[PDB]
Amino acid sequence: VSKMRMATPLLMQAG
Amino acid sequence: DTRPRFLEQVKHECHFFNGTERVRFLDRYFYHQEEYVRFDSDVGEYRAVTELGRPDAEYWNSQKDLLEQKRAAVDTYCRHNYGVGESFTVQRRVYPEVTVYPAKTQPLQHHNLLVCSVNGFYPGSIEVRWFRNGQEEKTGVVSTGLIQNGDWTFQTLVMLETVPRSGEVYTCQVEHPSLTSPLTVEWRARSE
Amino acid sequence: IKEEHVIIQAEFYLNPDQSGEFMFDFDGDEIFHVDMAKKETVWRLEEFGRFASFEAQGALANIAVDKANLEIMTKRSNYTPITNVPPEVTVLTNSPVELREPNVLICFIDKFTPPVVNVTWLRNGKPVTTGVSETVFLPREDHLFRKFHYLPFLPSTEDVYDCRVEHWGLDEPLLKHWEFD
């Protein structure tokens, strides 16, 4: 089987 | 529970044109329903959709490797996942089942609704046509449109307003990517 | 020319409920979601998992980033809460009804937010759970949600059915009725 790839959300800048 | 609620959504979107010849990737960020920042592969960097997204677009765009990775998503993510899923999604074909019945039991010469119920098909694109004695009815057709059942099948109900009379044969004709030729189901006009 | 297909990986995180969701959508149907409690991939149709795999554990790190981003935006927005959008509810059968021949009632819950509902099937006013199933919250292009609930049943002249939906945008529970004829 082949693997579905996951997109990653970016962490926003806090402060 | 009356406590206020706060919702964050992220949608990583892959839009495919002409197979996978042209692909558009969208990295989209939402607060409740309001998109505030996005990456569009057609633009090539993050852009603030609202003013609340300005700090994130500026920060993320400053990270060079991060931007190159998102710019390659059309290949490493979109095209890859299309390839992995193609066999059971893009290529999924399931036959429609077609049932025809009059909506009410009437003697002939009285107005009636002939129902063409089309069920269980995949994909959603379908053409349903009504015919009377081989002539297409372009009037009096009432349709629900496409109904998604949530389980990778669709249904649609297409009704025809008519006055059934002796000798008439009404035909519901269905064209669908699962079919090599139109599927037809007849109702010969009859009392009750 | 118009697009042929769209695949969306949709995620959400909701405070203060602390509810997260991670799913893939193809042309409006759910390919799979990750069970957040059991940390496992749930293919919408079992056959899908004979062609594809997905590492469920990575979805939980995504949701944690989603949670962290939500808390930032909550503060950034000066704690502006969501506006409840009550759902439209429709009940249909998946197949033409034949008396005493098995069928399925579908409760279609559409165009609502936040993604939190209570759904009950009622047969002659009594809750029914035998064989019921349901989807997770599906994304809409307007960024509201859809959801489906299902009830296998044996059509008859003697029973009536309601889908009862509770949602914070409703003043009262919404019942959507179905009976033969």
Residue numbers in the entry:
A (entry chain G): 5 to 19
B (entry chain B): 2 to 193
C (entry chain A): 1 to 181
Pull text from the paper.
Presentation of antigenic peptides by major histocompatibility complex class II (MHC-II) proteins determines T helper cell reactivity. For MHC class II (MHC-II) molecules, which typically reside in late endosomal vesicles, the noncanonical HLA molecule HLA-DM (DM) acts as peptide exchange catalyst. Typically, DM encounters MHC-II in complex with a class II-associated invariant chain peptide (CLIP), the placeholder peptide derived from the invariant chain (CD74) that assists MHC-II proteins during folding. The MHC-II proteins HLA-DR, HLA-DQ and HLA-DP are heterodimers consisting of a highly polymorphic β-chain and an α-chain showing little (HLA-DQ and HLA-DP) or almost no (HLA-DR) polymorphism.
Here, we compare a set of MHC-II proteins consisting of the DRA1*01:01 chain and 12 different DRB1 allotypes in terms of their peptide exchange properties. Although these complexes cover a range of thermal stabilities between 64.1 °C (DRB1*07:01) and 87.3 °C (DRB1*01:02), they all show essentially the same three-dimensional fold. Thus, these CLIP-bound allotypes apparently occupy the stable ground-state structure with CLIP bound in the same canonical orientation and register. Although we see no significant differences in ground-state structure, we still expect polymorphisms to influence CLIP affinity and exchange, as they may alter the dynamic properties of the peptide binding groove. For all analyzed allotypes, CLIP was predicted to bind with its canonical core motif (MRMATPLLM). Interestingly, all allotypes retain the capability to sample the same conformational states MS3 and MS1, but CLIP affinity and pMHCII stability alter the occupancy of states of the individual allotypes.
